[PDB]
Design a protein around this ligand. Structure first.
Ligand SMILES: Nc1ncnc2c1ncn2[C@@H]1O[C@H](COP(=O)(O)OP(=O)(O)O)[C@@H](O)[C@H]1O
Ligand SMILES: Nc1ncnc2c1ncn2[C@@H]1O[C@H](COP(=O)(O)OP(=O)(O)O)[C@@H](O)[C@H]1O
Ligand code: ICS
Ligand code: CLF
Ligand code: SF4
Ligand code: FES
Ligand SMILES: [Mg+2]
Ligand SMILES: [Mg+2]
Lengths: 121, 274, 477, 283
């Protein structure tokens, strides 16, 4: 799995290959590769690791489970429209916004954007 | 059904003046809503008579999630007319400090606590920095009317300017408008006509000038409002007059943000700073 | 009837749960109103099971290996991890097929990586590569390999994608790495989705160049029929008698060649919408292949589906469909005439995994039974919108029902027949209530088509009207 | 050869003057110091550069399109022998108020301004609410020693408590420690021993007590530090002693969180708030 990290804080987007389905989440692959995404909790409630996820290969989209904690934190930041919630509940499709500490790496190429700010502007 | 918000620097009597305004609004047959976004949950202390109202997010986290949260567990009506809700805030350094407002207001519309019995809904938002949840009521157009609490201190004027910039930025999104300026008084000279002049250059009106009085501290020890403590107190009549001008205020304008140098010029011409 | 009695029943059932469990479970029980089109305002589906409530849902590995990938015969499926997972899923499902075991077919055999402590501590990539090599040496005839990951594979962080690519390049063989860890998802639905995604991202893309196949304006691909007891064969012969040509069967008696040839098919007939709607949608979006849902449970549903199926082709197919209907009419007429009077008026509740509760109401209603309660373990909201119309008014609807719950509703309702899985057959059989295994047809079948309808009616008369049900109570009690 | 320092506390405390007069006393020492104003007001360099206001980093970014094209010399201005940069805040209501902080320090680290050519580095950061960017130095270990400018006001107590909670939160993955508190007088009789009490309960010490002096405005009118104005005045001596003990602070302790109930009692003990009782709640 290829990941492309992009941010205004980083002069250049970083490309790096990741192992899909590791118990360590995208938070781990961010830490091992010298990319800093603000992290402020170990229980997945702060929401400071909110990021934009884009799957460049639209055909290769992998189903996943949107857990209730991630759902509620996305509601707490507000980055969860009703239609995205319904789509994730029915078709098991990922939403555009994710949390770096709760998103699992899937076998595809992904682009992750962040502003360096905690979730919620 | 009008929605209002107190914006301003902390410690300028936002919670106290707001709560006394609520006490004044309760008696003339009006049912009103109060929620405070201040991270310290002291915005509903005087009405509810509780030592500290259990805020939304604390008992949402203890109950696992906000879905397992009941409206009755947070919607406490210390007085018959008015109900009281506290948004709360996270631990310092844990995420954005304004998402508590997000969750509180979202849950409030989800359970429909705004139904068929509301005359005024009034929020107490920290106006030191408008960002995230603090800037939110400007953004989704939830609060139609905004009132700014200020004093003669320069940081109060700068905070009011930041509020003006924020509302100007989001004027086209909705009917968010500045209904006027209310200024509490510290024991310093040449104050009321100052804030009047700030309103004059802001394009807005000055609502009322509330002074510093002794009865407020006694009410603080009592944990009941001045109007509930001493209805004959001149400060109680002052709060009643303030409330009746809020109800009878008609003009809602788009403010004009003011630069640093002109603010400084007013400050030196009044001599508040050298 | 007695809708008020139903909601008072569910209130009196939900009291024992604590506040969290009670509040969560109250969203998963409802009284059916056929006028409702969006079930989201009446029933909530696809949620995590409450801990410690004796749930019936499986794992994603069950939904992928034991449901989708397993029926395929010419490929070898490797349970990557400990020993129990494959062992409990070995030949426990009656996905019938034709072939020779251990030589050219490997459905009813168990391939596992045999993980031990060192495998967990150090990793299983090299062991997986050696296992792939040993599979190639011991089994030359097989057309391909799939590697189903289990919970430890995902938890310890092995790269099965890389080893799959490397070994497939080295041996010129199709290796499909699928990540179906049991903790992934809340039920078998995510297993279905993961298996579908793996099928899409490996097999479908394996050949796009080939055109050597001769197509016909009458190519139809069966989707989501697993030949449980021979269901897919009956559906296939019914289709071929109508004049069409069945190219692919997914996945009962399914072959990898059929899977690869499927995109060259004029029309897709999806049987199980839940398990295989994702691939149907992907096919429609990419190859422009139209797909639609058909039901082959009971004579009425079979006739309706056959007519709707013939409606998508020229008049010759419609004439052949009418000929088939006329030919097969007397058989099911005689079956109905024989069995309906013994079967008239009985009330039945159902609880099966997905789309089976809604598919078989027609067969029950044809024989004079009525369904008073139904539900699903893992169906989503769309299946509920589809099934609300097919059920009568003031009937029971449940999602992820628990053992205590289901026991209380059956005790209060007191039906005459209950169709559900093995895990409830013997808890309900000791209460003196007839029970039918709705998953494996109780080692019988098939139930599709008129031939399967005859089996269905025979088995239901056999189970319901048995003398053993009259002797549960001692004469001196 | 770098000691990294942060100045924290509520807004309107008077910390920005404290930082600038403190930096000027380090200039008399001859220490090469850095001042980074991480405050949206963008005024923490007025009394050093004799200017109206330093042009912050984001104004350079907006006039130049991107931050990368920015040169070091326009951002950093050398006055009084000390170099100055200012971060500021974005337009109020969009994004994070502390965003520029993240824009500033990172860019500093990119341009080598943080390389060890200075004795001391200070960040004047608004500490009214602990938020991303405002808490970024505590999190990314960019400020080794933290000092709180706290007055005798309830708000100052609350802000100091929140900052100490932040430091103790990040007190396991970095060397961010709290040196002590600095008291700026608000003409309160019992404020000095009050902040003494919270220093003791917090597990730390007082750095100094700053008295309310009228010469501060007289220095501000020319936009200069009090040290340059009247080096012979007593306020200059107070700031010099504060600088000497700032250099000599060796107590960098992990603070102890204090409950709000105890904060209420501490204000009642120093007589600032009257004696509350439960049987006098209804009237
Ligand atoms: N009209 C008044 N007369 C005297 N004191 C007042 C008046 N209004 C506010 N205050 C004082 O201002 C302080 C600010 O209180 P509060 O509103 O709770 O905090 P904030 O202003 O941060 O919301 C209170 O301690 C109160 O004693
Ligand atoms: N030591 C002092 N003595 C008297 N007044 C002071 C002192 N320090 C600051 N002030 C006053 O406090 C006011 C605001 O302080 P300032 O430094 O702007 O607060 P902040 O640190 O929040 O920016 C100034 O106008 C100044 O006159
Ligand atoms: S695939 Fe599914 S549990 Fe759709 S996992 Fe399960 S052979 Fe059931 S209700 Mo066994 S979603 Fe098929 C099913 Fe239905 S194994 Fe069979 S009967 S129609
Ligand atoms: S939910 Fe699914 S079936 Fe369960 S383990 Fe997980 S992948 Fe598998 Fe097999 S091995 Fe035994 S039974 Fe489990 S405990 Fe470890
Ligand atoms: S948006 Fe405001 S409240 Fe939220 S983290 Fe940034 S500064 Fe703090
Ligand atoms: S680190 Fe807090 S939610 Fe991810
Ligand atoms: Mg307050
Ligand atoms: Mg300042």
């Amino acid at each position: 799995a290829t990941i492309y990290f992009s941010s205004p804080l980083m002069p250049h987007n970083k490309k790096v290959q990741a192992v899909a389905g590791k118990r360590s989440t995208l938070l781990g692959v961010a830490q091992e590769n010298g990319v800093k995404i603000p992290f402020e909790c170990q229980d997945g409630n702060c929401g400071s690791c909110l990021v934009k996820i884009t799957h460049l290969d639209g055909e290769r989209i992998k189903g996943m489970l949107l857990t209730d904690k991630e759902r509620n934190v996305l509601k707490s930041v507000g980055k969860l429209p009703k239609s995205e919630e319904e789509r994730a509940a029915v078709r098991d499709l990922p939403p555009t916004y994710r949390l770096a500490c709760q998103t699992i790496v899937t076998d595809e190429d992904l682009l992750v954007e962040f502003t360096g700010e905690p979730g919620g502007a | 059904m009008r929605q209002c918000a107190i914006y301003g620097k902390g410690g300028i009597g936002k919670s106290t003046t707001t709560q006394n305004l609520v006490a004044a609004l309760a008696e003339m047959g009006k049912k009103v809503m109060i929620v405070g976004c201040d991270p310290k949950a002291d915005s509903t202390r005087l009405i509810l008579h509780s030592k500290a109202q259990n805020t939304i997010m604390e008992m949402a986290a203890e109950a696992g999630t906000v879905e397992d949260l009941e409206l009755e567990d947070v919607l406490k009506a210390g007085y018959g007319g008015v109900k009281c809700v506290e948004s709360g805030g996270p631990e310092p350094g844990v995420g954005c400090a304004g998402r508590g407002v997000i969750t509180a207001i979202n849950f409030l519309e989800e359970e429909g606590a705004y139904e068929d019995d509301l005359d005024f809904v009034f929020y107490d938002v920290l106006g030191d920095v408008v960002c995230g949840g603090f800037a939110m009521p400007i953004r989704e157009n939830k609060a139609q009317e905004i009132y700014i609490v200020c004093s003669g201190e320069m940081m109060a004027m700068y905070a009011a300017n930041n509020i003006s910039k924020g509302i100007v930025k989001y004027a086209n999104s909705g009917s968010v408008r500045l209904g006027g300026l209310i200024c509490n008084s510290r024991n310093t000279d040449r104050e009321d006509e100052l804030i009047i002049a700030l309103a004059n250059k802001l394009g807005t009106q000055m609502i009322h000038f509330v002074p510093r009085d002794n009865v407020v501290q006694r009410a603080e020890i009592r944990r009941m409002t001045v109007i509930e403590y001493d209805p004959k107190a001149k400060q109680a009549d002052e709060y009643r007059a303030l409330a009746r001008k809020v109800v009878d205020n008609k003009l809602l304008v788009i403010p004009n943000p003011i630069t640093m140098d002109e603010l400084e010029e007013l400050l030196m011409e009044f001599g508040i700073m050298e | 009837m007695s809708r008020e009695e139903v909601e008072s029943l569910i209130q009196e059932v939900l009291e024992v749960y604590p506040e969290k469990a009670r509040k969560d479970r109250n969203k998963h029980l409802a009284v059916n109103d056929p006028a409702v089109t969006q079930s989201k305002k009446c029933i909530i589906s696809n949620k995590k099971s409450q801990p410690g409530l004796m749930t019936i849902r499986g794992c994603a590995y069950a939904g992928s290996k034991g449901v989708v990938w397993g029926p395929i015969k010419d490929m070898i499926h490797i349970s990557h991890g400990p020993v129990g997972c494959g062992q409990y899923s070995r030949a426990g499902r009656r996905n019938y097929y034709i072939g020779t075991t251990g030589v050219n077919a490997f459905v009813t055999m168990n391939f596992t990586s045999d993980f031990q402590e060192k495998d967990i501590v150090f990793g299983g990539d090299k062991k997986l590569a050696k296992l792939i090599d040993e599979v190639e040496t011991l089994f030359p005839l097989n057309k391909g390999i799939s590697v189903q990951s289990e919970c430890p594979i995902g938890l310890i962080g092995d790269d099965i994608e890389s080893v799959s690519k490397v070994k497939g390049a080295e041996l010129s063989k199709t290796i499909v790495p699928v990540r179906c860890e049991g903790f992934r998802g809340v039920s078998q639905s995510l297993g279905h989705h993961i298996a579908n995604d793996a099928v899409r991202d490996w097999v479908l893309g394996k050949r796009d160049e080939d055109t050597t196949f001769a197509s016909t304006p009458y190519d139809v691909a069966i989707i989501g029929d697993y030949n449980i007891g021979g269901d897919a064969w009956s559906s296939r012969i019914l289709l071929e008698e109508m004049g069409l040509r069945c190219v692919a069967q997914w996945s009962g008696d399914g072959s990898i060649s059929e899977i690869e040839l499927t995109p060259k098919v004029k029309l897709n007939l999806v049987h199980c919408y839940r398990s295989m709607n994702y691939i149907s949608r992907h096919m429609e979006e990419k190859y422009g292949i139209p797909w639609m849902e058909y039901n082959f449970f009971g004579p009425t549903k079979t006739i309706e589906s056959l007519r709707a199926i013939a409606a998508k082709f020229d008049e010759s197919i419609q004439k052949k469909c009418e000929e088939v209907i006329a030919k097969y009419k007397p058989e099911w007429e005689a079956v109905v005439a024989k069995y309906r009077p013994r079967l008239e008026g009985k009330r039945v509740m159902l609880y099966i995994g997905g789309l089976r509760p809604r598919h078989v109401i027609g067969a029950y209603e044809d024989l004079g039974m009525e369904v008073v309660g139904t539900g699903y373990e893992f169906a989503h909201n769309d299946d509920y919108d589809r099934t609300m119309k097919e059920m009568g008014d003031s009937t029971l609807l449940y999602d992820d029902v628990t053992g205590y719950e289901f026991e209380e509703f059956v005790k209060r309702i007191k039906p005459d027949l209950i169709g559900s899985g093995i895990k409830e057959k013997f808890i309900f059989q000791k209460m003196g209530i007839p029970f039918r295994e709705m998953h494996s047809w109780d080692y019988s079948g098939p139930y599709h088509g008129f031939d399967g309808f005859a089996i269905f009616a025979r088995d239901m008369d056999m189970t319901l009207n048995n003398p053993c049900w009259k002797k549960l109570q001692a004469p001196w009690e």
